[PDB]
């Protein structure tokens, strides 16, 4: 009702999401960007040999190197699913949805979120790994034998364009919640309440971007456009994962069913 | 130029140009669909036969060739409209070509929704109505060309856009700076920025009760890009499952590496 209260409620939502995102995601964009500047410093993996030396220096929790890198990547993606699941609980309204729809939203949303947040850890020349302790170069990843060489590259191509928007963690918190609350996922039972929540999240995102990036014309539309493009990257990624299944034990297989 | 009066002037210009370029508008289609000479209904083989009388030798392929033809006329109308968008004809000529090549299909499906309800689609300048169920009953792979368009249209049509809204949306689609092989990206994104500002103002003034309509409309890009990807896929199937299919050179050029 009273003047300014609509704006205040949207700011309070934005703050709530930010505080939750901090809680759920230990290596924030702010922390990663400071590391990427390069003054401490992560171990740099820039070829096969330094990879072998890097496995001495960083204890990895997870036979052909392209395949070991891929398996590492899989371990990390499983960890990230658990972080994103915990974050999703803090999005107002999520835990009160039909339990099956909660499962569906996360099933189809986590990949989009993984690649969004991976851009926070990337520059045009490589990616922070193992909690910011390692940095693997884009050139080394590109050098891996087909089809592994082409796995990581499109993610770098997306990241450089996405990072050009210069979002901060306060922006990304809201953007990731908008992705999760997508009413268009297959097999959703109750679409309307999901769209209702996403509507309030979009309002909060729009106000956040208008206040944080006033000189960035139509940043809100531009961000929704990236949302559109993440869908592309994911479908292409899933296309690639299938190729592997066919062209390239059981308890491991189960942890990684996806 | 981004003061309110400039944005309304741009809105009104595009609407005028849209009415000049596209003879069958949503307004005209909706008047036809709702009873104002009722269109001839094609719902089975016997009614198709009479309709071909009263409005290849094989049905599915005849339906295909008639649809290609309408696609060519659509491309022609969209090109006339694109030329009217301020700034378009001033761009590098190769980029004008690229924008049309990649933009026409997205616009084709957007505007097709104007001709659709959940039961069917207006054909032959609004003189025929071909049912969704008939289209779904066509032999492989033809029974699958139209169904994703119907799904999209039902949802898109729930946004309740009118011709004045669509004229700006379609311009936004054409001026997309992410098309493959654009040489001069910034001039295109500058124009699109101004079209987005105009679109935002238009929806806020034309649909003041419709919460986040701007965002919900831009989210329909996801549906549109996916429709076009599916359509390219279905053309690849046709290449495998069919004999000679005569293909108009305009369509051949657009499909070339698409």
Secondary structure (DSSP) of A183-239: TTSTT-S-HHHHHHHHHHHHHHHHHHHHHH-TTSTTHHHHHHHHHHHHHHHHHHHHH
CA A173-B226-A157 angle, 5° bins: 55
Residues of B within an 8 Å Cβ radius of A: 178, 193, 196-197, 200, 211-212, 214-215, 218-219, 221-223, 225-226
Q: Which residues contact B60 (CB under 8 A, 6 or more apart)?
A: B138, B139, B142
* Tokens read off for B38: 């009722």
* Rounded-to-integer distance, Cα A11 and Cα A29, Å: 21
| Resolution as reported, in Å | 1.9
The CA–CA distances, whole Å, from B48 to B51, B59, B146 equal 5, 9, 17
Residue whose entry in the numeric block shows the structure tokens 């796995």: A151
CB-based burial of residue B240 (10 Å sphere; 0-12 exposed, 13-18 middle, 19+ buried)?
Answer: exposed
Based on the number of CB atoms within 10 Å of its own CB, is B60 exposed (0-12), middle (13-18) or buried (19 or more)?
middle
Named by the residue before each, gaps in chain A exceeding 2.5 A from C to N are 39, 62, 248
Chain B interface disruption, residue of A188, A224, A227, most B CBs within 10 A: A224
E-strand spans in chain B? 40-42, 116-117, 120-123, 128-131
Nearest to B164, CA basis, from B5, B12, B4, B3: B12
How many other β-carbons are positioned within 10 Å of the β-carbon of residue A81? 17
Cβ pair B122, B32 in contact under 8 A: yes
Determination technique for this entry: X-ray
Binding residues of B: 68-71, 105, 231, 255
- Beta-carbon contacts of residue A137 (< 8 Å; ≥ 6 apart): A44, A45, A46, A125, A126
The distance in angstroms from the start CA to the end CA of chain A is 46
Contacts of A218 in chain B (CB under 8 A): 193, 196-197
Sign of CA dihedral B237, B238, B239, B242: positive
Nearest residue in B to A230, CA atom: B222
What is the spatial distance between Cα A15 and Cα B107, in angstroms, rounded to a whole number? 39
Q: Which of B178, B158, B23 is nearest to B106 (CA)?
A: B178
Residues 6 or more apart whose Cβ sits within 8 Å of residue A36: A123, A128
Q: For residues A124 and A156, is the Cβ–Cβ distance under 8 A?
A: yes
CB contact under 8 A, A199 and B211: yes
**Close Cβ partners of A4 (under 8 Å, ≥ 6 residues apart):** none
State the smallest CA–CA distance between residue A138 and chain B in angstroms.
Answer: 23
Q: What are the residues whose beta carbons fall under 8 Å from the beta carbon of A105, sequence distance 6 or more? A: A88, A94, A97, A180, A181, A182, A185, A188, A194
**CA-to-CA separations, A129 to A32, A167, B178, B236, in angstroms, rounded:** 10, 21, 30, 40
Parallel/antiparallel/unpaired status of strands A134-137 and A43-45: parallel
User: In the sheet that A126-129 helps form, which strands lie side by side, from edge to edge?
Assistant: A43-45, A134-137, A126-129, A122-123
Instruction: Please tell me the distance from the alpha carbon of residue A133 to that of residue B107, in angstroms, as a whole number.
Output: 48
CB atoms near residue B135 (< 10 Å): 21
Gap between the Cα atoms of A89 and B58, Å rounded: 56
Report all structural domains of chain B as residue ranges with CATH numbers, in order of start. 1-258 (1.10.565.10)
Residues followed by a break in chain B, C–N over 2.5 Å?
A: 36, 55
- B7: which residues sit within 8 A by CB, 6+ positions away? B194, B197, B198, B201, B202
What CA–CA distance (Å, rounded) separates B109 from B195? Answer: 20
Q: How far apart are CA B208 and CA B204, in angstroms?
A: 5
């Amino acid at each position: 009702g009273p003047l300014g209260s609509e704006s205040a409620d949207l700011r309070a939502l934005a703050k709530h999401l930010y505080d939750s995102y901090i809680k759920s995601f230990p290596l924030t964009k702010a922390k990663a960007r400071a590391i990427l500047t390069g003054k401490k410093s992560p171990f740099v993996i820039y070829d096969m040999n330094s990879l072998m030396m890097g496995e001495d220096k960083i204890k990895f929790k997870h036979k052909e190197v392209a395949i070991r890198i891929f398996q590492g990547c899989q371990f990390r993606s499983v960890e990230a699913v658990q972080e994103i699941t915990e974050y999703a609980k803090s999005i107002p309204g999520f835990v009160n949805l039909d339990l099956n729809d909660q499962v569906t939203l996360l099933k189809y949303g986590v990949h989009e979120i993984i690649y969004t947040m991976l851009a926070s850890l990337m520059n045009k020349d490589g990616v922070l790994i193992s909690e910011g302790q390692g940095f693997m170069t884009r050139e080394f990843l590109k050098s891996l034998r087909k089809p592994f060489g082409d796995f990581m590259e499109p993610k770098f191509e997306f990241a450089v364009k996405f990072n050009a928007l210069e979002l901060d963690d306060s922006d990304l918190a809201i953007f990731i919640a908008v992705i999760i609350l997508s009413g268009d996922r297959p097999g959703l039972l109750n679409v309307k309440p999901i769209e209702d929540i996403q509507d309030n999240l979009l309002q909060a995102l729009e106000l956040q971007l208008k206040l944080n990036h006033p000189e960035s014309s139509q940043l809100f539309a531009k961000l929704l456009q990236k949302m559109t493009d993440l869908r592309q990257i994911v479908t292409e990624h899933v296309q690639l994962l299938q190729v592997i299944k066919k062209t390239e034990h059981p308890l491991l297989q189960e942890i990684y069913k996806d």
